[PDB]
């Protein structure tokens, strides 16, 4: 037999490249860097340029730019027009025809930023994997980040792909995201979806866990320092933990009823809650992408229609959604060319 | 030592009980038990409540055609306003139900119960040798609940503006509140959103690093990963400073959002950028703020009844 | 595609993986094949849904 | 705890819970 170990052959260009990439400098480049640093960079650049010079006059009929007189809250990089349904909006594509100015006017900057940002997210996750492999650690941060990347993929690519075009994807801005939120409330009743409920529970529980864990750890510390300040009474090379698990367990078992008794389980729970919540939210938005919304409660609608003297908070929410849709559609969707006369606009006093 | 009062004090303050009671306990336990009993009873079999005071009752009980999502305990009638409305001051029990007294009962008892809960957290921390600053952390949710249930109605002028004790009631409260005050553009709600999202981020990432580090080192081995992943070398090298930061971020965020809600109760507002961009000749160029304003205007027009019979 | 498959199959019957690829992708473990197959069905699921 | 056995079962992995891992096969060139 002719056996073999690991790395018992002649060196190759790949070995030199790998050695250079995985050095120890201020910024760890690694192989994933070749995908992360350029892409992400451009993304940020795009957005900044998008929020500083270009305008959304020809896409949404809006003015969103510092050069046009907008704040940091109102500036945005607006999505392309609904005519460009799902065109990737390459600079060299049939729409822009290679003209950079017309490309910016058509809204291609949004597609540029979105695609480069998606690949930057992929590169960042690969970077986390590479760092963990370099330092021989389990890559749970990779899963914790699998959560937000799933949320981003859903909201920014699957929702517009299931709808009429990129026009209905979120526009990269503060007021733009607020418009997105109110649009979902009006048109999808997103608050009534069980999956946004699960996501809300996950996020709020994550905040609760963070606060409670910090408070408990800082208020069960061991007195290993003469000074009145407890931050200097600790060094990274300690042997024992710096807080009393027994005391915290007893405190939270006598105040609340149940308490943790395992550091690993506690921290894994902290990892688990937000990831699960955001994944549920992502599934819900995937459902919304096909207009499979939780809206009806058919029995309530039937009962409300039968006798006007039956009002629940659900019916009031439905009326508020009707108002939102009717009063927003005129300007939020200019391609529909909607002209609602004041007579037909829903109003409370008409009930 | 053998006096009955001494024995009662020892039992109340004893740390051997399965659930610590304490004096804050002797105050709260009847309060929260009353609140939960009345809440369950009203959520299941309460009759319709005239929230708006225009003889148009709103049904919120399971028996009266509702489910868990759409059920709620309707706030008190707008006719009562801020007036104290116990059972003994209503003309009859039916009128007390009609106007919406159980909401006032539940909210008052619940607020007292949560305050005494914050007190007994400190009390047990003191009886156990722990440091006393978990009540400070708990003061944030307590402050937010106090705002939503007592301070907003105080500023607005009626308990009908408080958050209904329900799910769809909560969503209705949010939608109306956005219509009236434009919460999304207030810096304090922005800080609250930042606090919540950052708390989720930090919980997830702290759990990831600690779980990775814990093998069969807790801060000296994982710090190598985080120092180079997103740079920030020697950002949080202390297991104490890191945990204090965890405790401080969401608590401050929620304090700020509660203060923002209270200020909106006294009604300053969120930001208002309506018609903030105009070209030459004075024409108005729309921004995303204008679309948000259109949505708010629709919400408001639906919220107001005006024509009431 | 059919024809190519056949040809590809023949190649994969008659040519062994390189040692560098054998250790890089951990071809000795049955879990790498699971990961790759999950990715393939994942891709096919998006394609068919679209 | 080391020596996960030829069956891949480790009584207590770094998680502290029992687990099973695949047995990677080592590489050769010709063999007998």
């Amino acid at each position: 037999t002719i056996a073999i170990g690991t790395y018992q052959e002649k060196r190759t260009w790949f070995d030199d490249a790998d050695d250079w990439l995985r050095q120890d400098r201020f910024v760890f480049v690694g192989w994933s860097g070749l995908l992360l640093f350029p892409c992400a960079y451009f993304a940020l650049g795009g957005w900044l340029t998008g929020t500083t010079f270009v305008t959304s006059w020809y896409t949404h009929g809006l003015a969103t730019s510092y050069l046009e007189g907008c704040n940091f809250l109102t500036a945005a990089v607006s999505t392309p027009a609904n005519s460009m349904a799902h065109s990737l909006l390459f600079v060299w594509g049939p729409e822009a025809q290679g003209d950079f100015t017309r490309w910016c006017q058509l809204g291609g900057l949004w597609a540029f930023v979105a695609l480069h940002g998606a690949f930057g997210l992929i590169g960042f996750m690969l970077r986390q994997f590479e760092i963990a492999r370099s330092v021989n650690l389990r890559p749970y941060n990779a899963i914790a980040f699998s959560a937000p990347i799933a949320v981003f993929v859903s909201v920014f690519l699957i929702y517009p792909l299931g709808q009429s075009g990129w026009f209905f994807a979120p526009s990269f801005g503060v007021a733009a995201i607020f418009r997105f939120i109110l649009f979902f409330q009006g048109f999808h009743n997103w608050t009534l979806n069980p999956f946004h409920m699960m996501g809300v529970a996950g996020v709020l529980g994550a905040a609760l866990l963070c606060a409670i864990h910090g408070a408990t750890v800082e208020n069960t510390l061991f007195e290993d320092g003469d000074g009145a300040n407890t931050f200097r009474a600790f060094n990274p090379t300690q042997a024992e933990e710096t807080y009393s698990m027994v005391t915290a367990n007893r405190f939270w078992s006598q105040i609340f009823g149940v308490a943790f008794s395992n550091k690993r389980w506690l921290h894994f729970f902290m990892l688990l809650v937000p990831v699960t919540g955001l994944w549920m939210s992502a599934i819900g938005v995937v459902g919304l992408a096909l207009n499979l919304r939780a809206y009806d409660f058919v029995s309530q609608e039937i009962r409300a229609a039968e006798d006007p003297e039956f009002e629940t908070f659900y019916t009031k929410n439905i009326l508020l959604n009707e108002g939102i849709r009717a009063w927003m559609a005129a300007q939020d969707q200019p391609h529909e060319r909607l002209v609602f006369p004041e007579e037909v606009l829903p109003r409370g006093n008409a009930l | 030592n053998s006096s009955l009062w001494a024995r009662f004090c020892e039992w109340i303050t004893s740390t051997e009980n399965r659930l610590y009671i304490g004096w804050f306990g002797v105050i709260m336990i009847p309060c929260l038990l009353t609140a939960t009993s009345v809440f369950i009873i009203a959520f299941i079999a309460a009759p319709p409540v005239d929230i708006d005071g225009i003889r148009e009752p709103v049904s919120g009980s399971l028996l009266y055609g509702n489910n868990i999502i759409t059920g709620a305990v309707i706030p008190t009638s707008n006719a009562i306003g801020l007036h104290f409305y116990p059972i003994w001051e209503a003309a009859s029990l039916d009128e007390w139900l009609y106007n919406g007294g159980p909401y006032q009962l539940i909210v008052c008892h619940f607020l007292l119960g949560v305050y005494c809960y914050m007190g007994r957290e400190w009390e047990l921390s003191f009886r156990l040798g722990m440091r006393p600053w978990i009540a400070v952390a708990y003061s944030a949710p307590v402050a937010a609940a106090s705002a939503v249930f007592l301070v907003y109605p105080i500023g607005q002028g009626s308990f009908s503006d408080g958050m209904p004790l329900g799910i769809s009631g909560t969503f209705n409260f949010m939608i109306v509140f956005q219509a009236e005050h434009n919460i999304l553009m207030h810096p304090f709600h922005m800080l609250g959103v930042a606090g919540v999202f950052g708390g989720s981020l930090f919980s997830a990432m702290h759990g990831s690093l600690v779980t990775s580090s814990l093998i069969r080192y807790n801060i000296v081995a994982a710090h190598g990963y985080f120092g180079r992943l997103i740079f920030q070398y020697a950002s949080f090298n202390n297991s104490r400073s890191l945990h204090f930061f965890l405790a401080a971020w969401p608590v401050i965020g929620i304090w700020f959002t509660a203060l923002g809600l209270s200020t909106m109760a006294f009604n300053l507002n969120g930001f208002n950028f309506n018609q903030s961009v105009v070209d030459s000749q004075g024409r108005v160029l729309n921004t995303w703020a204008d679309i948000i304003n259109r949505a708010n205007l629709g919400m408001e027009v639906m919220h107001e009844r005006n024509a009431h019979n | 595609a059919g024809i190519l498959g056949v040809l590809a199959g023949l190649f994969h019957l008659c040519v062994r993986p390189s040692i560098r690829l054998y250790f890089g992708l951990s071809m000795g473990s049955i879990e790498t094949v699971l990961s790759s197959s999950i990715a393939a069905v994942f891709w096919a699921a998006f394609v068919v849904a679209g | 705890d080391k020596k996960l056995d030829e069956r891949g079962v480790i009584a207590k992995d770094n998680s502290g819970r029992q687990n099973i891992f695949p047995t990677s096969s080592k590489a050769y060139y010709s063999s007998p």
Binding site: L137, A142, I143, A150, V286 | - | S35, A39 | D13, N14
Partner: peptide, 25 residues
């Protein structure tokens, strides 16, 4: 497809990090 993306991530992580997960050399 989304759930299987998560599954792919998890199983690839448990492949590449086999030694660390098993706590061996």
């Amino acid at each position: 497809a989304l759930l299987f993306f998560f599954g792919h991530i998890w199983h690839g992580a448990r492949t590449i990090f086999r030694d660390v997960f098993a706590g061996i050399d």
